[PDB]
Protein backbone atom coordinates (compact mmCIF):
# COMPACT_ATOMS: atom_id res chain seq x y z
CA UNK A 1 0.00 0.00 0.00
CA UNK A 2 2.38 2.92 -1.54
CA UNK A 3 1.45 6.23 -1.28
CA UNK A 4 3.34 9.78 -2.07
CA UNK A 5 3.14 12.98 -0.18
CA UNK A 6 4.21 15.93 -1.80
CA UNK A 7 4.51 19.32 0.04
CA UNK A 8 2.86 21.98 -2.81
CA UNK A 9 3.64 25.99 -2.54
CA UNK A 10 0.58 27.84 -4.68
CA UNK A 11 -2.45 27.74 -2.75
CA UNK A 12 -5.93 26.64 -4.35
CA UNK A 13 -6.88 29.85 -6.21
CA UNK A 14 -8.87 28.33 -9.13
CA UNK A 15 -11.32 25.67 -9.70
CA UNK A 16 -10.02 22.26 -11.50
CA UNK A 17 -12.13 22.91 -14.73
CA UNK A 18 -9.65 23.24 -17.69
CA UNK A 19 -12.00 26.03 -19.17
CA UNK A 20 -10.79 28.20 -16.49
CA UNK A 21 -8.12 26.48 -14.39
CA UNK A 22 -5.30 28.67 -14.59
CA UNK A 23 -3.72 28.37 -10.95
CA UNK A 24 -0.92 26.80 -10.58
CA UNK A 25 -1.24 24.06 -8.09
CA UNK A 26 -4.57 23.91 -9.78
CA UNK A 27 -2.86 23.50 -13.65
CA UNK A 28 -0.74 20.75 -11.49
CA UNK A 29 -3.55 18.24 -10.47
CA UNK A 30 -4.58 18.68 -13.89
CA UNK A 31 -1.68 17.14 -15.82
CA UNK A 32 -2.53 14.30 -13.41
CA UNK A 33 -6.17 14.09 -13.69
CA UNK A 34 -6.97 14.70 -17.35
CA UNK A 35 -5.45 14.05 -21.04
CA UNK A 36 -5.09 15.74 -23.82
CA UNK A 37 -4.96 14.10 -27.16
CA UNK A 38 -1.42 14.99 -27.18
CA UNK A 39 0.18 15.81 -24.01
CA UNK A 40 3.79 17.55 -23.08
CA UNK A 41 6.00 15.38 -20.34
CA UNK A 42 5.98 18.30 -17.32
CA UNK A 43 9.74 17.68 -17.49
CA UNK A 44 10.71 17.28 -20.86
CA UNK A 45 7.92 19.11 -22.37
CA UNK A 46 8.12 16.53 -25.62
CA UNK A 47 4.76 15.57 -26.84
CA UNK A 48 3.24 11.82 -26.56
CA UNK A 49 0.17 10.09 -27.52
CA UNK A 50 -2.48 10.49 -24.79
CA UNK A 51 -6.14 10.01 -25.78
CA UNK A 52 -4.50 9.96 -29.56
CA UNK A 53 -4.54 6.16 -30.56
CA UNK A 54 -1.59 6.55 -32.75
CA UNK A 55 0.28 9.93 -34.52
CA UNK A 56 -2.86 12.44 -35.98
CA UNK A 57 -2.97 11.59 -39.58
CA UNK A 58 -2.57 15.07 -42.00
CA UNK A 59 -4.84 14.73 -44.49
CA UNK A 60 -3.64 18.14 -46.08
CA UNK A 61 -2.48 21.55 -45.08
CA UNK A 62 -5.67 21.86 -43.06
CA UNK A 63 -6.84 18.93 -42.13
CA UNK A 64 -6.11 16.05 -39.38
CA UNK A 65 -7.67 13.28 -38.48
CA UNK A 66 -7.39 11.86 -34.78
CA UNK A 67 -8.53 8.44 -33.47
CA UNK A 68 -9.52 7.77 -30.13
CA UNK A 69 -6.91 5.35 -27.61
CA UNK A 70 -9.29 2.03 -27.36
CA UNK A 71 -10.61 1.69 -24.10
CA UNK A 72 -9.95 5.11 -22.91
CA UNK A 73 -12.56 6.01 -19.78
CA UNK A 74 -13.62 8.75 -17.20
CA UNK A 75 -12.85 8.79 -13.64
CA UNK A 76 -16.82 7.82 -13.20
CA UNK A 77 -16.83 4.66 -15.36
CA UNK A 78 -18.10 5.85 -18.82
CA UNK A 79 -16.49 5.88 -21.78
CA UNK A 80 -14.37 8.79 -23.63
CA UNK A 81 -16.02 9.01 -26.25
CA UNK A 82 -15.64 11.70 -29.58
CA UNK A 83 -18.71 13.99 -29.02
CA UNK A 84 -16.46 14.42 -25.33
CA UNK A 85 -14.11 15.37 -27.61
CA UNK A 86 -15.57 17.93 -29.83
CA UNK A 87 -17.47 19.66 -26.75
CA UNK A 88 -14.17 20.12 -25.00
CA UNK A 89 -12.76 22.32 -27.89
CA UNK A 90 -16.30 24.30 -29.33
CA UNK A 91 -16.63 24.94 -25.24
CA UNK A 92 -13.10 26.42 -24.91
CA UNK A 93 -14.06 28.27 -28.38
CA UNK A 94 -17.32 29.94 -27.30
CA UNK A 95 -17.17 33.37 -26.17
CA UNK A 96 -20.06 32.84 -23.95
CA UNK A 97 -18.06 30.26 -21.71
CA UNK A 98 -15.46 32.71 -20.92
CA UNK A 99 -12.61 30.35 -20.85
CA UNK A 100 -9.02 31.70 -20.32
CA UNK A 101 -7.53 29.43 -22.89
CA UNK A 102 -8.86 30.11 -26.66
CA UNK A 103 -6.08 32.67 -27.84
CA UNK A 104 -3.76 29.19 -27.42
CA UNK A 105 -5.96 27.89 -30.34
CA UNK A 106 -6.44 30.45 -32.64
CA UNK A 107 -5.88 28.24 -35.90
CA UNK A 108 -8.54 26.12 -34.91
CA UNK A 109 -11.67 26.30 -37.53
CA UNK A 110 -13.76 23.14 -36.71
CA UNK A 111 -13.43 19.83 -34.43
CA UNK A 112 -15.95 17.69 -35.89
CA UNK A 113 -16.48 13.70 -35.10
CA UNK A 114 -16.68 11.32 -38.01
CA UNK A 115 -17.83 8.17 -35.65
CA UNK A 116 -17.49 6.31 -32.84
CA UNK A 117 -13.73 6.83 -33.23
CA UNK A 118 -12.00 9.84 -35.58
CA UNK A 119 -12.26 12.96 -34.90
CA UNK A 120 -11.84 15.65 -38.07
CA UNK A 121 -9.44 18.80 -37.28
CA UNK A 122 -10.14 21.53 -39.58
CA UNK A 123 -7.40 24.62 -39.56
CA UNK A 124 -7.85 28.37 -40.86
CA UNK A 125 -4.33 27.92 -41.45
CA UNK A 126 -1.34 25.53 -41.49
CA UNK A 127 0.17 25.66 -38.19
CA UNK A 128 2.77 23.35 -37.78
CA UNK A 129 2.44 22.82 -34.00
CA UNK A 130 -1.08 21.52 -33.64
CA UNK A 131 0.55 18.08 -32.18
CA UNK A 132 2.11 20.62 -29.75
CA UNK A 133 -1.20 22.82 -28.63
CA UNK A 134 -3.38 19.62 -27.70
CA UNK A 135 -2.06 19.67 -24.42
CA UNK A 136 -3.87 22.56 -23.55
CA UNK A 137 -7.68 21.07 -24.42
CA UNK A 138 -8.23 18.60 -21.53
CA UNK A 139 -10.92 16.03 -22.82
CA UNK A 140 -14.08 16.51 -20.37
CA UNK A 141 -16.75 14.59 -19.37
CA UNK A 142 -19.85 15.99 -21.77
CA UNK A 143 -22.28 14.69 -19.57
CA UNK A 144 -20.93 15.76 -15.77
CA UNK A 145 -19.36 19.55 -16.97
CA UNK A 146 -23.86 19.97 -18.17
CA UNK A 147 -25.31 18.42 -15.04
CA UNK A 148 -23.02 21.71 -13.63
CA UNK A 149 -20.38 23.47 -14.41
CA UNK A 150 -19.47 24.66 -10.60
CA UNK A 151 -19.65 21.19 -9.58
CA UNK A 152 -17.27 19.89 -12.08
CA UNK A 153 -15.21 22.47 -10.92
CA UNK A 154 -14.83 21.60 -7.68
CA UNK A 155 -14.92 17.57 -7.90
CA UNK A 156 -13.30 17.16 -11.76
CA UNK A 157 -14.07 14.08 -13.55
CA UNK A 158 -11.11 13.24 -16.20
CA UNK A 159 -9.00 10.15 -17.66
CA UNK A 160 -5.70 11.06 -16.40
CA UNK A 161 -3.92 7.98 -14.56
CA UNK A 162 -5.41 9.91 -11.24
CA UNK A 163 -8.51 10.16 -9.94
CA UNK A 164 -9.56 13.56 -7.81
CA UNK A 165 -11.01 12.30 -4.18
CA UNK A 166 -11.08 15.67 -2.86
CA UNK A 167 -9.61 19.34 -2.11
CA UNK A 168 -9.75 21.59 1.35
CA UNK A 169 -8.10 24.86 1.16
CA UNK A 170 -5.22 25.41 3.59
CA UNK A 171 -4.87 21.75 3.74
CA UNK A 172 -4.63 18.92 1.08
CA UNK A 173 -5.33 18.10 -2.70
CA UNK A 174 -5.94 13.79 -2.23
CA UNK A 175 -5.88 11.54 -5.17
CA UNK A 176 -6.12 7.81 -6.03
CA UNK A 177 -5.10 5.29 -8.88
CA UNK A 178 -7.35 5.25 -12.10
CA UNK A 179 -7.01 1.39 -12.41
CA UNK A 180 -8.40 1.54 -15.98
CA UNK A 181 -6.34 3.98 -17.28
CA UNK A 182 -4.05 2.21 -20.32
CA UNK A 183 -1.98 5.54 -21.34
CA UNK A 184 1.53 5.77 -21.62
CA UNK A 185 1.90 6.81 -17.58
CA UNK A 186 -0.01 4.47 -14.98
CA UNK A 187 -0.24 5.72 -11.50
CA UNK A 188 3.15 4.05 -10.21
CA UNK A 189 1.43 4.34 -6.29
CA UNK A 190 -2.29 4.09 -4.75
CA UNK A 191 -2.60 7.44 -2.91
CA UNK A 192 -1.69 10.74 -3.22
CA UNK A 193 -1.82 13.41 -0.66
CA UNK A 194 -0.47 17.13 -1.76
CA UNK A 195 -0.21 19.17 1.37
CA UNK A 196 -1.05 22.48 0.89
CA UNK A 197 1.67 24.37 2.23
CA UNK A 198 2.28 28.37 1.41
CA UNK A 199 3.88 29.47 4.33
CA UNK A 200 7.82 28.51 4.01
CA UNK A 201 8.72 27.79 6.39
CA UNK A 202 5.93 24.60 7.05
CA UNK A 203 6.70 23.77 3.74
CA UNK A 204 10.88 23.49 4.70
CA UNK A 205 9.30 21.71 7.89
CA UNK A 206 7.50 19.31 6.25
CA UNK A 207 10.64 17.78 4.21
CA UNK A 208 13.47 18.18 6.35
CA UNK A 209 11.14 16.41 9.20
CA UNK A 210 10.62 13.55 6.62
CA UNK A 211 7.03 13.81 6.42
CA UNK A 212 7.08 14.78 2.84
CA UNK A 213 9.45 13.41 0.02
CA UNK A 214 9.30 16.96 -2.54
CA UNK A 215 8.04 20.08 -1.82
CA UNK A 216 8.29 22.85 -4.95
CA UNK A 217 9.56 26.11 -4.63
CA UNK A 218 11.90 25.56 -2.48
CA UNK A 219 12.78 28.91 -0.11
CA UNK A 220 16.24 30.90 -1.62
CA UNK A 221 17.26 30.95 2.06
CA UNK A 222 16.77 27.27 3.03
CA UNK A 223 18.06 25.80 -0.12
CA UNK A 224 21.89 24.55 0.58
CA UNK A 225 20.41 23.59 4.41
CA UNK A 226 17.82 21.04 2.85
CA UNK A 227 20.87 19.66 0.43
CA UNK A 228 22.44 17.68 3.75
CA UNK A 229 19.54 15.39 3.08
CA UNK A 230 17.36 15.83 0.28
CA UNK A 231 18.94 16.46 -3.48
CA UNK A 232 17.60 20.56 -4.53
CA UNK A 233 18.07 21.58 -7.94
CA UNK A 234 17.12 25.01 -9.00
CA UNK A 235 16.13 25.18 -12.96
CA UNK A 236 16.11 28.29 -15.26
CA UNK A 237 12.39 28.88 -15.81
CA UNK A 238 10.21 31.76 -17.86
CA UNK A 239 8.77 31.56 -14.24
CA UNK A 240 8.55 35.89 -13.57
CA UNK A 241 7.30 38.52 -11.80
CA UNK A 242 5.36 41.14 -13.77
CA UNK A 243 4.27 44.71 -12.92
CA UNK A 244 1.06 44.80 -14.51
CA UNK A 245 -0.83 48.70 -14.59
CA UNK A 246 -4.48 49.40 -15.11
CA UNK A 247 -3.85 51.20 -18.75
CA UNK A 248 -7.66 52.72 -18.60
CA UNK A 249 -6.65 54.72 -15.28
CA UNK A 250 -4.66 57.83 -15.28
CA UNK A 251 -1.77 58.64 -15.52
CA UNK A 252 -1.14 54.94 -15.83
CA UNK A 253 -2.56 55.11 -19.55
CA UNK A 254 0.66 57.27 -20.46
CA UNK A 255 3.31 54.62 -21.31
CA UNK A 256 5.65 57.43 -20.25
CA UNK A 257 4.33 56.69 -16.67
CA UNK A 258 4.43 53.42 -16.91
CA UNK A 259 8.22 53.15 -17.91
CA UNK A 260 9.50 55.20 -15.43
CA UNK A 261 8.57 52.68 -12.73
CA UNK A 262 10.35 49.93 -14.37
CA UNK A 263 13.31 52.43 -13.98
CA UNK A 264 12.37 53.11 -10.53
CA UNK A 265 12.83 49.69 -9.38
CA UNK A 266 16.47 48.35 -8.31
CA UNK A 267 16.87 45.03 -9.55
CA UNK A 268 19.81 44.36 -8.32
CA UNK A 269 19.07 44.62 -4.35
CA UNK A 270 15.96 42.80 -5.03
CA UNK A 271 18.29 39.44 -6.81
CA UNK A 272 20.42 40.07 -4.06
CA UNK A 273 18.11 40.30 -0.55
CA UNK A 274 14.95 38.11 -1.65
CA UNK A 275 16.37 35.38 -4.40
CA UNK A 276 20.24 35.48 -3.35
CA UNK A 277 21.20 35.75 -7.12
CA UNK A 278 18.78 32.94 -8.20
CA UNK A 279 17.17 35.18 -10.77
CA UNK A 280 17.95 37.74 -13.50
CA UNK A 281 16.18 41.16 -14.39
CA UNK A 282 14.24 41.27 -17.60
CA UNK A 283 16.11 42.12 -20.59
CA UNK A 284 13.17 40.66 -23.05
CA UNK A 285 9.91 39.14 -23.31
CA UNK A 286 11.63 35.93 -22.63
CA UNK A 287 14.44 35.12 -19.95
CA UNK A 288 17.78 35.13 -21.82
CA UNK A 289 18.62 31.05 -21.98
CA UNK A 290 14.74 30.57 -23.82
CA UNK A 291 16.17 29.34 -27.43
CA UNK A 292 13.57 32.30 -28.98
CA UNK A 293 15.80 34.91 -26.50
CA UNK A 294 16.06 37.84 -28.28
CA UNK A 295 17.50 40.94 -26.10
CA UNK A 296 14.59 43.74 -26.57
CA UNK A 297 15.21 47.46 -27.78
CA UNK A 298 13.84 48.69 -24.27
CA UNK A 299 15.75 47.99 -21.52
CA UNK A 300 14.35 49.10 -17.61
CA UNK A 301 18.03 48.97 -15.37
CA UNK A 302 17.85 50.85 -12.67
CA UNK A 303 18.02 54.51 -13.57
CA UNK A 304 16.32 56.93 -10.67
CA UNK A 305 17.00 60.32 -12.76
CA UNK A 306 15.22 59.03 -15.69
CA UNK A 307 12.45 57.93 -14.08
CA UNK A 308 12.43 61.65 -12.67
CA UNK A 309 12.59 62.69 -15.71
CA UNK A 310 10.19 60.56 -17.35
CA UNK A 311 7.50 61.82 -14.75
CA UNK A 312 8.33 65.35 -14.95
CA UNK A 313 7.57 64.80 -18.88
CA UNK A 314 4.20 63.13 -18.25
CA UNK A 315 3.65 65.98 -15.86
CA UNK A 316 2.64 64.03 -12.87
CA UNK A 317 3.59 66.39 -9.61
CA UNK A 318 1.87 64.24 -6.84
CA UNK A 319 1.04 60.74 -7.95
CA UNK A 320 -0.82 58.17 -5.19
CA UNK A 321 -1.79 55.00 -5.59
CA UNK A 322 -1.95 51.81 -4.11
CA UNK A 323 0.26 48.68 -4.72
CA UNK A 324 -2.45 45.14 -5.10
CA UNK A 325 0.22 42.14 -5.13
CA UNK A 326 -0.12 38.49 -4.53
CA UNK A 327 0.01 36.76 -1.06
CA UNK A 328 3.37 34.30 -1.81
CA UNK A 329 5.89 34.40 0.45
CA UNK A 330 8.77 35.92 -2.13
CA UNK A 331 6.18 38.19 -3.56
CA UNK A 332 6.14 39.67 0.17
CA UNK A 333 9.68 39.92 0.20
CA UNK A 334 9.75 41.41 -3.03
CA UNK A 335 7.06 44.10 -1.77
CA UNK A 336 8.97 46.34 0.18
CA UNK A 337 11.82 46.68 -1.68
CA UNK A 338 9.78 48.01 -4.57
CA UNK A 339 8.03 50.46 -2.62
CA UNK A 340 11.40 51.04 -1.38
CA UNK A 341 12.53 52.33 -4.40
CA UNK A 342 9.07 53.98 -5.71
CA UNK A 343 8.36 55.66 -2.40
CA UNK A 344 12.31 56.87 -3.25
CA UNK A 345 10.86 59.34 -5.78
CA UNK A 346 10.00 62.76 -5.30
CA UNK A 347 6.59 63.20 -7.04
CA UNK A 348 5.32 59.07 -6.40
CA UNK A 349 3.92 57.58 -3.26
CA UNK A 350 2.73 54.12 -3.20
CA UNK A 351 0.68 51.81 -0.62
CA UNK A 352 0.66 48.44 -0.37
CA UNK A 353 -2.12 45.97 -0.12
CA UNK A 354 -1.71 42.09 -0.26
CA UNK A 355 -4.54 39.92 -1.06
CA UNK A 356 -4.63 36.05 -2.03
CA UNK A 357 -4.06 35.33 -5.91
CA UNK A 358 -7.74 33.80 -6.33
CA UNK A 359 -9.38 37.34 -4.57
CA UNK A 360 -7.30 39.90 -6.26
CA UNK A 361 -8.02 38.75 -10.09
CA UNK A 362 -11.88 37.97 -9.55
CA UNK A 363 -12.66 40.85 -7.03
CA UNK A 364 -10.24 43.52 -8.24
CA UNK A 365 -7.79 42.91 -11.49
CA UNK A 366 -10.77 41.52 -13.62
CA UNK A 367 -13.20 44.34 -12.72
CA UNK A 368 -10.63 47.02 -13.21
CA UNK A 369 -10.55 47.82 -9.63
CA UNK A 370 -7.04 48.75 -9.32
CA UNK A 371 -4.42 50.91 -10.17
CA UNK A 372 -0.76 48.77 -10.06
CA UNK A 373 0.02 44.96 -9.41
CA UNK A 374 2.66 42.93 -9.01
CA UNK A 375 2.29 39.25 -8.77
CA UNK A 376 3.79 35.75 -10.40
CA UNK A 377 3.30 34.37 -13.62
CA UNK A 378 4.08 30.97 -15.74
CA UNK A 379 2.38 30.42 -18.67
CA UNK A 380 5.21 27.51 -20.14
CA UNK A 381 2.80 25.29 -17.77
CA UNK A 382 0.95 25.48 -21.83
CA UNK A 383 4.44 24.51 -24.15
CA UNK A 384 7.75 26.85 -24.37
CA UNK A 385 6.61 28.07 -28.62
CA UNK A 386 7.12 31.60 -28.42
CA UNK A 387 3.74 32.06 -29.76
CA UNK A 388 2.48 30.27 -26.99
CA UNK A 389 4.29 32.54 -24.66
CA UNK A 390 3.18 35.80 -26.30
CA UNK A 391 -0.30 35.27 -26.72
CA UNK A 392 -1.09 34.22 -22.94
CA UNK A 393 -0.91 38.08 -21.77
CA UNK A 394 -1.30 39.79 -25.69
CA UNK A 395 -3.60 37.44 -27.73
CA UNK A 396 -7.49 38.64 -28.25
CA UNK A 397 -9.37 39.17 -24.88
CA UNK A 398 -8.66 37.60 -21.73
CA UNK A 399 -5.51 39.56 -20.32
CA UNK A 400 -5.49 42.95 -22.82
CA UNK A 401 -9.18 43.99 -22.59
CA UNK A 402 -10.70 42.04 -19.63
CA UNK A 403 -7.39 43.12 -17.64
CA UNK A 404 -5.25 45.42 -18.12
CA UNK A 405 -7.24 47.22 -20.30
CA UNK A 406 -5.31 48.12 -23.06
CA UNK A 407 -6.83 46.73 -25.79
CA UNK A 408 -8.30 50.30 -26.62
CA UNK A 409 -4.66 50.99 -28.36
CA UNK A 410 -3.19 51.65 -31.97
CA UNK A 411 0.01 49.37 -29.92
CA UNK A 412 -2.54 46.77 -29.06
CA UNK A 413 -4.12 46.51 -32.69
CA UNK A 414 -0.23 46.45 -33.97
CA UNK A 415 0.42 43.78 -31.46
CA UNK A 416 -2.51 41.68 -32.70
CA UNK A 417 -1.37 41.79 -36.66
CA UNK A 418 2.46 41.02 -35.73
CA UNK A 419 1.43 37.66 -33.80
CA UNK A 420 -1.20 36.51 -36.38
CA UNK A 421 1.44 37.42 -39.39
CA UNK A 422 4.12 35.22 -37.38
CA UNK A 423 1.66 31.77 -36.47
CA UNK A 424 0.82 32.32 -40.46
CA UNK A 425 4.11 32.83 -42.15
CA UNK A 426 6.70 30.15 -40.21
CA UNK A 427 9.59 31.78 -42.63
CA UNK A 428 9.03 35.35 -41.15
CA UNK A 429 8.08 34.86 -37.68
CA UNK A 430 11.37 35.78 -35.88
CA UNK A 431 11.09 39.29 -37.13
CA UNK A 432 7.33 39.38 -36.79
CA UNK A 433 8.10 38.37 -33.08
CA UNK A 434 10.71 41.06 -32.50
CA UNK A 435 8.36 43.70 -33.65
CA UNK A 436 5.55 42.51 -30.93
CA UNK A 437 8.29 42.18 -28.21
CA UNK A 438 9.70 45.47 -28.82
CA UNK A 439 6.42 47.14 -28.92
CA UNK A 440 5.83 45.53 -26.02
CA UNK A 441 8.68 46.44 -23.90
CA UNK A 442 8.41 49.82 -24.76
CA UNK A 443 4.94 49.78 -23.99
CA UNK A 444 4.76 47.84 -20.67
CA UNK A 445 1.24 47.19 -19.73
CA UNK A 446 2.73 44.02 -18.58
CA UNK A 447 6.46 43.22 -18.20
CA UNK A 448 8.39 41.21 -16.17
CA UNK A 449 10.31 42.51 -13.49
CA UNK A 450 12.63 39.62 -13.28
CA UNK A 451 12.51 35.77 -14.13
CA UNK A 452 13.71 33.62 -11.53
CA UNK A 453 15.04 29.47 -11.10
CA UNK A 454 13.13 27.32 -9.69
CA UNK A 455 14.43 25.15 -6.44
CA UNK A 456 13.07 21.69 -6.12
CA UNK A 457 13.38 19.54 -3.04
CA UNK A 458 13.43 15.38 -3.54
CA UNK A 459 14.44 12.28 -1.74
CA UNK A 460 16.04 10.53 -3.93
CA UNK A 461 16.11 7.43 -1.50
CA UNK A 462 12.09 7.93 -1.64
CA UNK A 463 11.13 8.18 -5.23
CA UNK A 464 11.91 6.63 -8.05
CA UNK A 465 12.47 9.03 -11.94
CA UNK A 466 11.32 12.35 -9.94
CA UNK A 467 12.62 14.93 -11.92
CA UNK A 468 12.02 18.71 -10.63
CA UNK A 469 9.75 20.99 -13.53
CA UNK A 470 11.16 23.78 -15.55
CA UNK A 471 7.71 25.51 -14.47
CA UNK A 472 5.59 25.47 -11.67
CA UNK A 473 3.81 22.68 -10.33
CA UNK A 474 5.29 19.00 -9.39
CA UNK A 475 4.77 16.03 -11.62
CA UNK A 476 4.22 12.61 -10.48
CA UNK A 477 3.92 11.05 -13.61
CA UNK A 478 6.14 7.49 -14.17
CA UNK A 479 6.81 8.62 -10.22
CA UNK A 480 7.83 5.70 -7.74
CA UNK A 481 7.56 5.03 -3.85
CA UNK A 482 9.77 3.22 -2.09
O1 LIG B 1 0.75 31.96 -15.48
C1 LIG B 1 -0.19 31.23 -15.37
C2 LIG B 1 -0.65 30.32 -16.50
O2 LIG B 1 -1.75 29.58 -16.06
N1 LIG B 1 -0.99 31.15 -14.19
C3 LIG B 1 -0.70 31.96 -12.97
C4 LIG B 1 -2.03 32.32 -12.29
C5 LIG B 1 -2.92 33.23 -13.09
O3 LIG B 1 -2.19 34.43 -13.22
C6 LIG B 1 -4.22 33.51 -12.31
O4 LIG B 1 -4.99 32.36 -12.07
C7 LIG B 1 -5.09 34.54 -13.07
O5 LIG B 1 -5.31 34.17 -14.40
O6 LIG B 1 -1.81 33.03 -11.05
C8 LIG B 1 -1.07 32.17 -10.12
O7 LIG B 1 -1.76 30.96 -9.94
C9 LIG B 1 -1.02 32.94 -8.85
O8 LIG B 1 -0.97 34.20 -8.94
O9 LIG B 1 -1.10 32.37 -7.72
C10 LIG B 1 0.28 31.85 -10.73
C11 LIG B 1 0.11 31.14 -12.03
O10 LIG B 1 1.44 30.76 -12.60
Sequence with gaps: ?????????????????????????????????????????????????????????????????????????????????????????????????????????????????????????????????????????????????????????????????????????????????????????????????????????????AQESGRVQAIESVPYLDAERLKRKNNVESVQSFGLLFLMFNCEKAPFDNPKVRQALHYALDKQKLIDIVFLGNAKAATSYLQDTHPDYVKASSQYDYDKAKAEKLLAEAGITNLTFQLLATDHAWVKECAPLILESWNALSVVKVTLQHLQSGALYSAHVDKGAYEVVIAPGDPSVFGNDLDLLLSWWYRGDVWPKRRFRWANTAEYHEVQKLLDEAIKNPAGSKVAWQKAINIIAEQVPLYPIIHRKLPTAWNTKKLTDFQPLPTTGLSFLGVGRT
Design 1 to 205: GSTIEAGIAYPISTGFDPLTSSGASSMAANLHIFEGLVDLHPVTRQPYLALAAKEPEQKDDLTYYISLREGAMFHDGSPVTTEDVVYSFERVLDPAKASLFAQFIPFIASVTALDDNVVEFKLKYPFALFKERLTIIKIVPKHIVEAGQSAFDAKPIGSGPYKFVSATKDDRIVFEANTVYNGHYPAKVEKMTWFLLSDDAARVT
